Amino acid sequence: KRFTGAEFIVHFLEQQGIKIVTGIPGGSILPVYDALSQSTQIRHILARHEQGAGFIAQGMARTDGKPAVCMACSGPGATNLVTAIADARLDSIPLICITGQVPASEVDTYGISIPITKHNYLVRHIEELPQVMSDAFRIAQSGRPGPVWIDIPKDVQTAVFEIQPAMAEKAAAPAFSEESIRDAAAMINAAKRPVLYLGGGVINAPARVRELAEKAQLPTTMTLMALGMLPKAHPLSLGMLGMHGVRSTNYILQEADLLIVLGARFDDRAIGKTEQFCPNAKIIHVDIDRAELGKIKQPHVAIQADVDDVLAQLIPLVEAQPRAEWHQLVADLQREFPCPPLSHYGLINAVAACVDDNAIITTDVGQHQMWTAQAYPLNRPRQWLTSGGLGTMGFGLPAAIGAALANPDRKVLCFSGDGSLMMNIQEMATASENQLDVKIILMNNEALGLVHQQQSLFYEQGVFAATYPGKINFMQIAAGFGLETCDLNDPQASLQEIINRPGPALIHVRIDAEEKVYPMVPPGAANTEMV
């Protein structure tokens, strides 16, 4: 089996089971595209902007649990991938990003990717192409996953060489001492007021995380990245903690004497001022990345491992306690806490009444996102797709497009705002041309909005450079991209019907720009200092 470099790339991608690949062609990547035209297994989706290609790859990857692939040419193609790749890095998503480059014989793609990738490559001769790709796919998916960037010079793609590529699979998870699991089991069994603090890393262990939470009867809080790890109404659900979390549980955490941290990284937006976050709490911290252990809070028991393997070795050693008095305390604090048509919360509720637990939910970034995180009943793992680490405006629509492509059966609702939706508005075309089942729920405040709230609450000269006049018609635009549109103006009947019928849709709702996301923790404050 003899190949050209481009044909080998395609063949390898086939043997990793890739069925979809998304990108945009250009000169320096045209050989791979030539080979890719010949694949009977891999379909190629043409984005309208390479940032869109990357975020669509991201939507696939955030729903499958496997790396997704995006492609671009040198120069502006590569540079346009940057935001999508960096977003992939800070939220820990397996992406393989393939870029053509000028013949080995320009823009320093390698250099630019150094600080935003889990690893990257410049293939200088074709003989390296097998190892490179096999290691890229290993690196992207092992340990703490992330994006790997492979830059391949055109003269390597059109070379020929001689070799059978297998399916690269994940590296083995770290080992961990049984004394550690014993010591954690002892601390959990002896704790008066434990809380279970879940992050985006527990995402492939819903069974054992649920089993643990219910056995030990642990109040469980989740980060923005862990919504759905317990169904919203679950009686142990403190819901989400932190900057815009629920007030009762922000106070409840300060009562904890031990917190069990699985898959979280103590980001300030969940923790607030580090030193004032659960001072009287001993900490157990289980994380697959050594570098996260003790990075922000020092744990009393630290395990570098996969959460599943730990919880497997830990649940049979954890006693099953009613924790009755601690629950009365949780409830008593909750009986002093805020609570929630075409309202913003009412809109979220109305849209939820239109779909199953089978829906996939995507968001852009801003007030509409925090509102959705607060009120939508997210009850499944890998149902909730949001950009948290980088917090990229424009993530929502292309992410939803990817999710649709990866699950053609399901419905993808994309809660967006007027500002974020314009960042990748062009991918509307991508949605209609593939006739994908994505429904954009646009809360249009004619404002940036999260900025509007930060300036109005915290800066002396108030709102500036954060408002729009309202001479943009979003229904006209979505219609010109080929989507059905709706403007609540039975309203519900129109909503349920626009959601029920297939194809991509835009649903538009006016919202007063003065509306707020409460509670808010002012930047740099303790989690007990909420507005």
Partner: protein, 89 residues
């Protein structure tokens, strides 16, 4: 107060941009760098002069995240080696 780290890394252009960029990006203090290829070998040594901080094992965890880093050790040589070396130039 100071230590040398010895890093064994794969020799390609440029692992040094990886390592240097890591130290800048994360605000690790470095007060002397030396990189030499290891002979009859596909690897190079990077020696760094760091502080023996409370921050040091976090520094090592970060460095070990780099794919090209094959090993990272605390190197038993006196830390005042680096400065003295300047004399030969």
């Amino acid at each position: 107060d100071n230590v040398i780290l010895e890093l064994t890394v794969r020799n390609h252009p440029g692992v040094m941009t990886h390592v240097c960029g890591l130290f800048a990006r994360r605000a690790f203090n470095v007060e002397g760098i030396l990189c030499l290829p290891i002979q009859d070998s596909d690897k190079s040594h990077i020696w760094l002069l760091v502080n023996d901080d409370q921050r040091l094992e976090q520094m090592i965890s970060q460095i070990d995240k780099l794919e090209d880093v094959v090993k990272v050790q605390r190197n038993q040589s006196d830390p005042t080696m680096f400065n003295k070396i300047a004399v030969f130039f």
